[PDB]
């Protein structure tokens, strides 16, 4: 009963399904698109600090630990496709890597970065793919 | 008989079902919505202290240990989805994390925080999801 | 023959059935409602002491060790839902916690607390639920 | 052959059937009701002593070791419902507790207490319930 | 059950399917074709530095670690075809070699090399072949 | 190492040391001597009850479980001298018998018996002898 | 190495040393002596309730769980002297009995009993004796 | 090598050394003494809330989790002295009890309780005693 | 050879040596003291963002992950003093807790918090104590 | 022969000796100091590219993979001080982390970053410390 031979196919197909949308750029925001689609308005208070105005609680997801650099994420994918997923060590390490890539960037008193782009963990398209990928590593 | 292969699917689907409602913001209150929906009225007694006026015993649930920070809770979810639920250690640790995230914030002599938001453990929509999630970790 | 996998479902469903009524506040009394529904009349004898007037023996249940703080009880429930009921240690500890939460508050020479609320162990609606819950922990 | 799983149900159902009647107060007497229903008449002989006048031998049951305080008995019940009756140690300890709660209070030269209430072990309604309860603990 | 005799055939056929397209040069770009097909425009800012103008997030794939020298890649293929894929050591080593050949060459502040050619990891035709090849080495 | 051959000698010598003083009657009181030496005064209140007047707390020993019938005690001694103290069963049984012979006879609302005699457990001469005797049975 | 033969002597001598002072009544208080020596003043507020006036924190020991009935305590001693302290079961049971005899009687809103006496756990003479006794049961 | 026989003596002597100072009341503060000795000034801002004014960082210890009810703490001591410290389970449980008794009561937005008293974990006299006591339970 | 009995003493003494200085407040900064002692000057650029002016590279330590809340740190200490350092699990968990308490608060584009205080990991007095403490958990 | 107890001390002392110099900022360069001390001159050729002019071969060390971000390196140190160096897994993981932090930043066709700082692996003062640190992890 080689259940590891079926988990490897699922892991690889999940990585590929995530790469398909990462190539298109879907789920990537800058300051403009973030503040436009999230509804958060930055009030540039005096003098060097400021804050976002929270109007609804559903916006608290945007200020959590749910952002990653696009280049770093696609590099994680390209290096993960070249691992021996027959072993448990690799399925643990790359799962930890895909779970720790999501770090906070926007906060209540920290505006979205000026020129950089960030990938949203809970984007409508990336949420199911990243969830399925993280769940594909869960095998005995 | 790999009963652990079925418990992992249930745990992950429960985390996802909870994330679906956490994204929508359902179950999150501020001072205004808390004091409106709970019926508690804050009497600003002299001078720096005060208290809520308890009219019915059903209001005692609101002043218990049933509140969590939305960002902290969704971060628990995002970090939990990247764990090896095939092992018992993880199913115990993340279960303790989802059971201890609920702390008291409103009390009899402590008014609801002024500007922060809190997630209600016994909200009508969040209660079944959190209960099922906590129960999904209970496997031999 | 995993009889422990069926006991966990019963324990969790009993905790939920009790929480459903604890949320509604049913079974919680203050001084007014206690002395009204129990028939006990407080005679304020001189000078700083007093006593309840016992008219029928059925009132001796009210003066036993059958009262708990609502917040403490619902907190026991919320923390109990996050335990590993697959183990015997937890089924013993939380059972002892649900058995020791009932302490005396009204006595023959001790009037019901002035402003606090208490939950009655032998309330018509709470008695079957608490009994079934305490019995759900009894598994080999 | 788990015969212990059926003895636990019987023990719990017997405790509940006893609690049902203890709540109603049936089987509890004071000085007035005891001396009225038992037929014993206290002759206040000189000077500080006295005695009951025994008219029929059937009254010797009333002066035996068959009395308990109602609060103590119902507290034994409320604490007993939270024991692990899967073990022999508990079935022995709580059985000894239900067998030793019955102490003498009226005697030939000791009148029934002035103001206290006592529960009669051989009351018509409590006798079968207490007997069945004591017998439910008798399992291998 | 010699599953290794079937994995070797798949590995070799994948290597051949990749070599067939590498021979035609498909997926190989220079500065002109890269900046034409990717949409990136190099602004030769003062004085010795410069940058590409990012118009859409889908362009972040081009600036990742997804480029390799054509000669080095075809040499990896020609030397890989002469390995003992019956052993796990070889299937691991050559898989790591095919996973590490992809290095970054264009960046935000690093223009595409002037005269050299590079092979694009996520080219429309080479992406499935390289993915299938990397997946063919994953056998127990 | 026959430590049981030395414990038997000590047990028998302790029984004899107790019998020597029991023969002389030392430590035996009636109503007169009890109420004289203890300081307790019986107030023959109306009508058939009464009580002792407690003047100092040191008198609470007299109203405890520290009285035995002289004939019963000397019979315990005479039957105990004919046991096989080489066995543990006998050393346990007769020790329990010498520990349970002390029962309460005078109480707050129970005057000393009119004509009977009683042996005081904490009499100045009998206390050390009874203590040493009870301690002689404690051997491995 | 019979360390149990030395622990038994210490246990018995500790029980005797405690009995010596219990016989004298030292450490026993009534309402008068309690309110005199503790400094607590009872303010008989309207109408049937009241409270003690706490002037110094050292008085909080008096309102803790540190009181026992004298008769019950001396009965525990007299029955404990007749146990087989060679066994661990007895050394555990009687230790639990000497640890649970101390119950609360005076509280902030509960005045000292009118006519009864109570034994103070932290009396200057009884504290070392009770501590040494409880510690004498601690043997492997 | 019975190292447990020496750890028990240290645990008991540490509990006694702590009880000696708990009896004296040292380390117990009310609102007046807390705000006097800590230097914190409560500014009764409008309307029902307020805060302490932090002048030096050394004051942050007072607002941590370092407060306990005096009665609860001395009750922990009196019940702990009656445990079998020869076993590891007890040394773990009572250590957790002495480590969790310290809860926060004063906070930045929560003034010290009006009339209650609290015991300070880091009081100059109680800190070494509590530290040594917690360390006495640490044995293999 | 119980090397674990010596490591516990070192761990506890290190925790105490750190608590001694945490009580004094040494190593805790606010915005004023941080920007004064570090030399960093905040330039309030337009409009809602800003940055510190880096004059020497030695200032990069202040902007790393080396800050903790004083209350959180001292609470880690008070809860750590109540652990079983005889076990490896505790020495690992509390070491991870003392290693993860240090989080970034000042950054290049994130000014020091306005009113909060933070504890500096590399303070001249706290660095050796925290280092020795972290090293005390390192035992086989 | 616990050779692991001496390797841990050496590892920790090496980490501390490196932190001592990282705090002072020694070994950190910007564009100005790098191009000044290394002798490399950037010729701003047309139009958006350029290059350093290599005058002596000793300058090839500066353009290798020998640069790291100061914050990242000191964070590696602060997180490394909290590891269990008794285990081989940690000594391998943190050694790989200290070996992979050094990445290339200046190249022949890539000028030193405009505003960032970098730490030089082969600085005269940091080279021996980093070498000793990397060598301290090499134990059986």
From Swiss-Prot, chains A, B, C, D, E, F, G, H, I, J:
SUPFAM superfamilies: TMV-like viral coat proteins. One of its GO terms (cellular component) is helical viral capsid. Keywords: Acetylation, Capsid protein, Helical capsid protein, Virion. Changing residue 78 to I: In PM2; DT1 and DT2. Its main location: virion. The modification N-acetylserine is found at residue 51. Changing residue 27 to R: In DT1 and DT2. It comes from the Viruses. It is found in: Virion. One of its GO terms (molecular function) is structural molecule activity. Capsid protein self-assembles to form rod-shaped virions about 18 nm in diameter with a central canal enclosing the viral genomic RNA. Belongs to the virgaviridae capsid protein family. This is Capsid protein. It comes from Tobacco mosaic virus (strain vulgare).
């Amino acid at each position: 009963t080689r259940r590891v031979d079926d988990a490897t196919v699922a892991i690889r197909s999940a990585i590929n399904n995530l790469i398909v949308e990462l190539i298109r750029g879907t789920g990537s925001y800058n300051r403009s698109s973030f503040e436009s689609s999230s509804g958060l308005v930055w009030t540039s208070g005096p003098a060097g600090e400021g804050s976002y105005s929270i109007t609804t609680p559903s916006q608290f997801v945007f200020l959590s630990s749910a952002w990653a650099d696009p280049i770093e994420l696609i590099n994680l994918c390209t290096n993960a496709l070249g691992n021996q997923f027959q072993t448990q060590h690799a399925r643990t390490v790359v799962q930890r890597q895909f779970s720790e890539v999501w770090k906070p960037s926007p906060q209540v008193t920290v505006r979205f970065p000026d020129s950089d782009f960030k990938v949203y963990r809970y984007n409508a398209v990336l949420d199911p793919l990243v969830t399925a990928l993280l769940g594909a590593f869960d095998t005995r």
